[PDB]
Coordinates of C-alpha atoms in Angstrom, one line a residue:
Chain A
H1 CA 153.1 13.9 165.2
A2 CA 149.9 15.4 166.6
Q3 CA 148.8 16.6 163.2
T4 CA 145.8 18.6 164.3
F5 CA 143.0 18.6 161.7
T6 CA 142.9 22.4 161.3
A7 CA 146.7 22.6 160.8
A8 CA 147.0 22.4 157.0
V9 CA 145.6 26.0 156.6
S10 CA 147.5 28.7 154.8
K11 CA 145.9 31.9 156.3
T12 CA 145.8 33.9 153.1
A13 CA 144.7 31.1 150.8
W14 CA 142.5 29.8 153.5
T15 CA 140.7 33.1 153.6
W16 CA 140.5 33.1 149.8
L17 CA 138.7 29.7 150.0
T18 CA 136.5 31.1 152.8
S19 CA 135.5 33.7 150.3
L20 CA 134.9 30.9 147.7
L21 CA 132.9 28.8 150.2
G22 CA 130.3 30.8 152.1
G23 CA 131.0 34.0 150.2
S24 CA 128.6 32.8 147.5
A25 CA 126.3 31.9 150.5
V26 CA 126.5 35.5 151.6
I27 CA 125.7 36.6 148.1
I28 CA 122.7 34.4 147.8
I29 CA 121.5 35.5 151.2
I30 CA 121.7 39.1 150.0
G31 CA 119.8 38.0 146.8
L32 CA 117.1 36.3 148.9
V33 CA 116.7 39.4 151.0
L34 CA 116.4 41.6 147.9
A35 CA 114.0 39.2 146.2
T36 CA 111.8 39.2 149.3
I37 CA 111.9 43.0 149.4
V38 CA 110.9 43.2 145.8
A39 CA 108.0 40.8 146.3
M40 CA 106.9 42.9 149.3
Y41 CA 107.1 46.1 147.2
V42 CA 105.0 44.4 144.5
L43 CA 102.4 43.3 147.0
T44 CA 102.3 46.8 148.6
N45 CA 101.9 48.4 145.1
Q46 CA 99.0 46.0 144.3
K47 CA 97.2 46.3 147.6
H48 CA 97.8 50.1 147.8
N49 CA 94.7 50.8 145.8
Chain B
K1 CA 71.5 52.3 127.5
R2 CA 72.2 48.6 127.4
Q3 CA 71.3 48.7 123.7
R4 CA 74.0 51.3 123.1
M5 CA 76.5 49.3 125.2
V6 CA 75.9 46.2 123.1
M7 CA 76.2 48.2 119.9
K8 CA 79.5 49.7 121.1
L9 CA 80.8 46.2 122.1
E10 CA 79.8 44.8 118.7
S11 CA 81.1 47.7 116.6
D12 CA 84.4 47.5 118.4
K13 CA 86.2 44.3 117.4
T14 CA 85.4 41.8 120.1
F15 CA 85.5 38.0 119.7
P16 CA 84.4 35.1 121.9
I17 CA 86.9 32.3 122.7
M18 CA 85.5 29.3 120.7
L19 CA 86.5 25.8 121.7
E20 CA 84.8 22.8 120.0
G21 CA 81.9 25.0 119.0
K22 CA 81.3 26.2 122.6
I23 CA 81.6 29.8 123.9
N24 CA 84.0 29.4 126.9
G25 CA 84.7 33.1 127.3
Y26 CA 85.2 36.5 125.7
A27 CA 88.2 38.6 124.7
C28 CA 88.6 42.2 123.7
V29 CA 91.1 44.8 122.5
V30 CA 91.7 47.8 124.8
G31 CA 94.4 50.4 124.4
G32 CA 95.5 48.7 121.1
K33 CA 96.6 45.4 122.4
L34 CA 94.6 42.2 122.9
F35 CA 94.0 40.7 126.3
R36 CA 92.8 37.2 127.2
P37 CA 92.0 35.4 130.5
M38 CA 94.6 32.7 130.8
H39 CA 92.3 30.2 132.5
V40 CA 90.0 30.2 129.4
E41 CA 91.2 27.8 126.7
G42 CA 90.6 28.2 123.0
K43 CA 91.4 30.6 120.2
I44 CA 90.0 34.1 119.5
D45 CA 87.2 34.2 116.9
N46 CA 89.4 36.1 114.5
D47 CA 92.0 34.5 112.2
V48 CA 93.9 37.8 111.8
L49 CA 94.0 38.3 115.6
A50 CA 94.7 34.6 116.2
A51 CA 98.0 35.1 114.2
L52 CA 99.2 37.3 117.1
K53 CA 101.5 35.5 119.7
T54 CA 100.3 36.1 123.3
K55 CA 102.4 36.4 126.5
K56 CA 101.3 34.8 129.8
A57 CA 100.8 36.5 133.2
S58 CA 100.2 33.7 135.8
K59 CA 99.8 36.2 138.7
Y60 CA 96.5 37.6 137.2
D61 CA 95.6 34.6 135.0
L62 CA 95.6 36.9 132.0
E63 CA 97.4 37.0 128.7
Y64 CA 98.3 39.9 126.4
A65 CA 99.6 40.4 122.8
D66 CA 100.6 43.1 120.5
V67 CA 98.0 44.3 118.0
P68 CA 99.1 45.8 114.6
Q69 CA 98.8 49.6 114.6
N70 CA 96.4 49.6 111.7
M71 CA 94.1 47.4 113.8
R72 CA 94.9 49.5 116.9
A73 CA 92.9 52.2 115.0
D74 CA 89.7 51.4 116.9
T75 CA 90.0 49.8 120.4
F76 CA 88.5 50.3 123.8
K77 CA 89.1 53.7 125.5
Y78 CA 90.2 53.3 129.1
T79 CA 89.7 55.8 131.9
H80 CA 90.9 56.0 135.5
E81 CA 88.0 58.1 136.8
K82 CA 86.0 55.4 138.7
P83 CA 83.6 57.1 141.1
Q84 CA 81.1 55.2 143.2
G85 CA 77.7 54.6 141.5
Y86 CA 76.5 52.2 138.8
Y87 CA 78.1 51.2 135.5
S88 CA 76.9 49.1 132.5
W89 CA 78.1 45.9 131.0
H90 CA 76.9 43.1 128.7
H91 CA 74.5 41.5 131.2
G92 CA 73.0 44.8 132.5
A93 CA 74.1 47.1 135.3
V94 CA 76.8 46.7 137.9
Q95 CA 77.0 48.4 141.3
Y96 CA 80.3 49.9 142.4
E97 CA 80.7 50.5 146.1
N98 CA 83.6 50.2 148.7
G99 CA 85.9 49.6 145.7
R100 CA 84.1 46.4 144.7
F101 CA 81.7 45.6 141.8
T102 CA 78.5 43.7 142.6
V103 CA 75.6 42.6 140.4
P104 CA 72.2 41.0 141.2
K105 CA 72.2 37.2 141.7
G106 CA 71.6 35.1 138.6
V107 CA 73.7 37.5 136.4
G108 CA 77.0 36.0 135.2
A109 CA 78.2 32.4 135.0
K110 CA 80.9 30.2 133.6
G111 CA 81.8 31.5 130.2
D112 CA 81.3 35.2 130.8
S113 CA 85.0 35.9 131.6
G114 CA 86.4 38.8 129.6
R115 CA 83.4 41.1 129.5
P116 CA 84.5 44.6 130.2
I117 CA 82.7 47.2 132.4
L118 CA 81.8 50.5 130.7
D119 CA 81.0 53.9 132.2
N120 CA 78.4 56.4 131.0
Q121 CA 80.8 57.6 128.3
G122 CA 81.5 54.1 127.0
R123 CA 85.0 53.9 128.5
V124 CA 86.3 50.7 130.1
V125 CA 86.7 50.8 133.9
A126 CA 87.2 47.1 134.7
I127 CA 87.3 43.6 133.3
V128 CA 85.2 40.8 134.7
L129 CA 87.1 37.6 135.3
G130 CA 84.9 35.6 137.7
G131 CA 82.5 35.8 140.6
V132 CA 81.1 34.2 143.7
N133 CA 77.6 33.6 145.0
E134 CA 76.7 36.5 147.3
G135 CA 73.1 35.7 148.3
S136 CA 70.7 38.2 146.7
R137 CA 73.6 39.5 144.6
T138 CA 76.9 38.2 143.3
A139 CA 80.3 39.9 143.6
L140 CA 82.5 39.9 140.5
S141 CA 86.3 39.4 140.6
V142 CA 87.7 42.3 138.5
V143 CA 90.9 44.1 137.7
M144 CA 91.1 47.9 137.7
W145 CA 93.8 50.5 137.1
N146 CA 94.4 53.7 139.0
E147 CA 95.5 57.0 137.5
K148 CA 99.1 56.0 138.5
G149 CA 98.9 53.0 136.2
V150 CA 99.0 50.3 139.0
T151 CA 97.2 47.0 138.2
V152 CA 95.1 46.0 141.1
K153 CA 93.1 42.7 141.1
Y154 CA 90.2 42.5 143.6
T155 CA 89.3 38.8 144.3
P156 CA 86.7 37.8 146.8
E157 CA 87.6 35.0 149.2
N158 CA 86.8 31.6 147.6
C159 CA 85.8 33.3 144.3
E160 CA 84.8 30.9 141.5
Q161 CA 86.2 31.1 138.0
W162 CA 83.1 32.3 136.0

């Protein structure tokens, strides 16, 4: 009756939940990078002249 | 020249921003749409123009609004040809050098925001928003537009809202 903490996983559904938890984190990291890039482009366009 | 500049500014519909009977700034119509410095509070001195709803642009502390085409009939003419030299505006001449506009000390103060800068042909080349004490002269914080249509705001370090 060891009942290891990480034993109630179900591989496929576990990966589905991994995509549900942290997948949105990856999405928002990509969004943050894109927003930073857009801000840098705006600053470059303004300072260009 | 200054006489002709004032005559052109008056004939073209330009109206100061009145608040409690005090002139706190100026606003003008260029390219057929009204612009107003956001930091200046009050309403344009024109009931017809005051009916227009403005949009805010915090980044440049400026506002803009759509002007009816019939009133777009006669507005300021903008140009992108901004060579080095001297230009004219309401309070006299302005020196343009190194990409910056400078005027002699004692010219310009709180309440002059919104005065455009005109070339020899009477075309707008920049809009005065503020300034900072620069000894024998003062450097104005202005916005200018290149031939590619890029809005560039030149702001001296620690510039005061004039």
